[PDB]
Each structure stands twice: as structure tokens, then as C-alpha cells.
Design a protein around this ligand. Structure first.
Ligand code: CU1
Length: 157
């Protein structure tokens, strides 16, 4: 039986933002994906910080505007009364905004997919972290977590 590969988004500190850390996505139990957030350097007083999967990659320029709109294949809404009514990539709307100067949390999401054949696939997309007023503060591409794959391989970074 096939299992889809884990993913990661690596945020780096630059003159544009002190936010740095990672969001890891790993297959979990009962058709869910475990999301592990580990971030520091957040500008707390302009949060709390929504964060979402966006539609386009972060380009080499690191312009978070270039990630364009939210990943929302099923046309969910920004506000809702049950998790499934939010966009697939609306992680903060379903699970909580990032908050504080540092934020470390783990949770399962039952909508994002690691499977490239799924309409809910998030590989190759991006994550944007926003100030509370919507300004995009930092962003990262969603890439493979492990260097080595296949049923005859090990991984050894
Ligand atoms: Cu966003």
C-alpha cells in the first residue's frame, strides 16, 4: 500500500522578517496529516497571525505577493461554523492563528493531502504568514522533507 511523502516549509530570517522555523507535514492516522509548527521571531503585537497555503510558489525574489491567492479548490469561506467549510489551505481558520513571539504546536488536518493525484494536494505550493491586518510577513515553499525515497532505499542526511 502506497503512502504519500512528507513535506516541509522552511521559513528564513531576512531584512524583511525575523520569522524563522518550519512547518512539517507528515502522514498520520485515519486519513489525516500531522502538522508540526515551530516558529520564532514573530512580531507579536501585529498578530495574531493567520497562515494559509497559497496557490503559487515563492519566487527567488522572496516576494510573498507572488504566491497569489489562497489554495481553495472547494471555494470555502473565510468565516465558517464547521471546519470543512473553510478552504483546504486555511490552516489558521481551522486550527488557530499563530500567536506570540514563538509558537510551537502539533495538530492533525483531515483536508490537506500529500497525494499528488488529489485535488487537495499541497505539494509544490507555498505557505504565507500574515499580520493581523493581512500584510504578508514571510512565506515559504512546501518541499519534500526527506532526501531519499523508494522501497529499496534509506535516507541519510
Ligand atoms: Cu495567506
Amino acid at each position: 500500500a502506497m503512502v504519500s511523502p512528507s513535506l516541509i516549509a522552511k521559513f528564513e530570517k531576512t531584512s524583511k522578517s525575523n520569522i524563522e522555523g518550519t512547518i512539517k507535514f507528515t502522514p498520520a492516522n485515519n486519513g489525516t496529516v500531522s502538522v508540526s509548527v515551530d516558529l520564532k521571531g514573530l512580531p507579536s503585537d501585529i498578530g495574531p497571525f493567520p497562515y494559509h497555503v497559497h496557490e503559487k510558489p515563492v519566487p527567488a525574489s522572496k516576494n510573498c505577493s507572488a504566491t497569489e491567492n489562497h489554495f481553495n479548490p472547494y471555494n470555502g469561506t473565510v468565516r465558517a461554523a464547521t471546519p470543512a467549510a473553510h478552504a483546504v489551505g486555511d490552516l489558521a481558520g481551522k486550527h488557530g492563528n499563530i500567536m506570540g513571539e514563538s509558537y510551537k504546536t502539533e495538530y492533525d488536518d483531515s483536508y490537506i493531502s500529500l497525494n499528488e493525484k488529489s485535488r487537495s494536494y499541497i505539494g509544490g505550493l507555498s505557505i504565507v504568514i500574515h499580520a493581523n491586518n493581512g500584510t504578508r510577513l514571510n512565506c515559504a515553499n512546501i518541499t519534500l522533507l526527506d532526501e531519499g525515497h523508494g522501497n529499496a532505499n534509506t535516507t541519510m542526511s
